[PDB]
Amino acid sequence: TTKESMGEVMKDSSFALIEAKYVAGENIKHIVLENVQNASIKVRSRQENIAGVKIPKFEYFTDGETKNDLTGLARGGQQVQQCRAAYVKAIELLVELASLQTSF
Amino acid sequence: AMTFNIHGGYLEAIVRGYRAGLLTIVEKCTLKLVDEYKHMLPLSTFLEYITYGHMIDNVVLIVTGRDVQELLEKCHPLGMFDSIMRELYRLVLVDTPLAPYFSECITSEDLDDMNIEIMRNTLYKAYLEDFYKFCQKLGGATAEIMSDLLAFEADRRAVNITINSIGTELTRDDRRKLYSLYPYGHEELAVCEDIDQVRGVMEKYPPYQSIFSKLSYGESQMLDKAFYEEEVKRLCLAFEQQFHYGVFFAYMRLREQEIRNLMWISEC
Amino acid sequence: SALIAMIADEDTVTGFLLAGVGNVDLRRKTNYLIVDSKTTVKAIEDAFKEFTTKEDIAIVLISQYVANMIRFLVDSYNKPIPAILEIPSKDHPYDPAHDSVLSRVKN
Structure with a gap:
């Protein structure tokens, strides 16, 4: 079910990237990599137990704790709302994949 | 009036014809426009200022390093000319209008040009210096267009500061100290912390009134x-372009806008 | 823990990599350039050895496994937590086709 999020949020991020490119041309990239305002990526882990199996739980920046932001680009708000919004979907997909592997 | 026929008439006619003809595809169009501009080489100072417009951003991008070698890939002659890290900044301080002022204003180098926000502040300061230099060369109707562009840049910077960059030390004082009628009445935007406040500030200029509108876009x-x-x-x-006047900057802006529109087209 | 791809469509990765800090999985001492298409994912596999296998990077992503060495990367099932792969869409369609983790998921 959550696999479709990896397409929907990706399409939204692509649209935001096109809008940002139309706004400010080429992004700064390089030193700060530009393209975002949120997503100071740092991941935290937790261990849940279901039927005696230690199913891991995953949280990270823009999908939990350890998140920070500063300024951003022109469409940096739109980029965060689309490109950084896929972070929650990615974290959920990663948690689901880890749980599936452990359960298997 | 007779000076136009005395000199610059042929160049003006060529520029007008090229603009009238205008309407990796985006990269190819940009390269063609840059080649057309370069082949055209009083008006020399105007062309130098027009090039320095984008050369300020090109030099700001090259100031990195940090994957600095990638700047050669975007070496478009229109804005990324080779002629236009404090040790390298001093060398790059030549052959540019805003560079000598930025040498003192941005003497902190990367400290005042951090890639997160302060690099944008240095770019805005350089843009303000370039706009001041362009406005210094007064004598034509392009002064109004240059003032409008500088006012738009300053107001956009102020709106961005009031929206979220206020937490990034872009306070009311920074709305003009670092963020590049505006050259005389920009103080009204120092307190426009809201979209409704932005519209109210825009109400001070009836031409700027209703331009913000719902402010959902732009x-x-x-x-x-x-x-x-x-x-x-x-x-x-700008599409009017009355004859017997400096229209090289207008043609360059129109070509840049056409390139931007082509890029925004992309895969439909 | 850290999480980054660095084997991706550049701006697509940078849109969720580093803006407020952490240097996109600590680029000061880890991570790599987020732009793909310069070479095969053999260097991306080496970076996974240098980033994901370095006990720091937890989640990784390869865009649709276009050149991600699906058979080679399918071995990441062992120790799944430090090698949580992903198949992002955009500029390459996300499909249940052969990949690192989805190939096993296809079973």
Whole structure:
């Protein structure tokens, strides 16, 4: 079910990237990599137990704790709302994949 | 009036014809426009200022390093000319109008040009210096267009500061100290912390009134896009281009806008 | 823990990599350039050895496994937590086709 999020949020991020490119041309990239305002990526882990199996739980920046932001680009708000919004979907997909592997 | 026929008439006619003909595809169009501009080489100073316009951003990008070698890939002669890290900044301080002022204003180098926000501040300061230099060369109707562009950039920077960059030390004082009627009445935007407040500040200029409108688009973007998008929408005024006047900058702006539109087209 | 791809469509990765800090999985001492298409994912596999296998990077992503060495990367099932792969869409369609983790998921 959550696999479709990896397409929907990706399409939204692509649209935001096109809008940002139309706004400010080429992004700064390089030193700060530009393209975002949120997503100071740092991941935290937790261990849940279901039927005696230690199913891991995953949280990270823009999908939990350890998140920070500063300024951003022109469409940096739109980029965060689309490109950084896929972070929650990615974290959920990663948690689901880890749980599936452990359960298997 | 007779000076136009005395000199510059052929170049003006060639520029007018090229503009009238205008309407990796985006990269190819940009390269063709840059080649057309270069082949055209009083008006020399205007061309130098027009090139320095984008050369300020090109030099700001090259100031990195940090994957600095990638700057050669975007070496478009229109803005990324080779002639236009404090040790390298001093060397790059030559052959540019805004560089000597930025040498003192941005003497902290990367400290005052951090890639997160302070690099944008240095770019805005350089843009303000370039706009001041261009406005110094007064004598034509392009002064109004240059003032409108500088006002749009300053207002967009102020709106971005009030929206979210206020937490990034872009306070009311920084709305003009670092963020590049505006050259005399920009103080009204120092307290426009809300979209409704932005519209109220825009109400001080009846031409700027109703330009913000609902502010859902254009003003929604940070950096210099808020009031710059208003100038992009109103660029139909630049499309007039009355004859016997400096229209090289107008043609360059129209070509840049066409390139941007082609890029925004992309895969439909 | 850290999480980054660095084997991706550049701006697509940078849109969720580093804006407020952490240097996109600590680029000061880890991570790599987020732009793909310069070479095969053999260097991306080496970076996974240098980033994901370095006990720091937890989640990784390869865009649709276009050149991600699906058979080679399918071995990441062992120790799944430090090698949580992903198949992002955009500029390459996300499909249940052969990949690192989805190939096993296809079973």
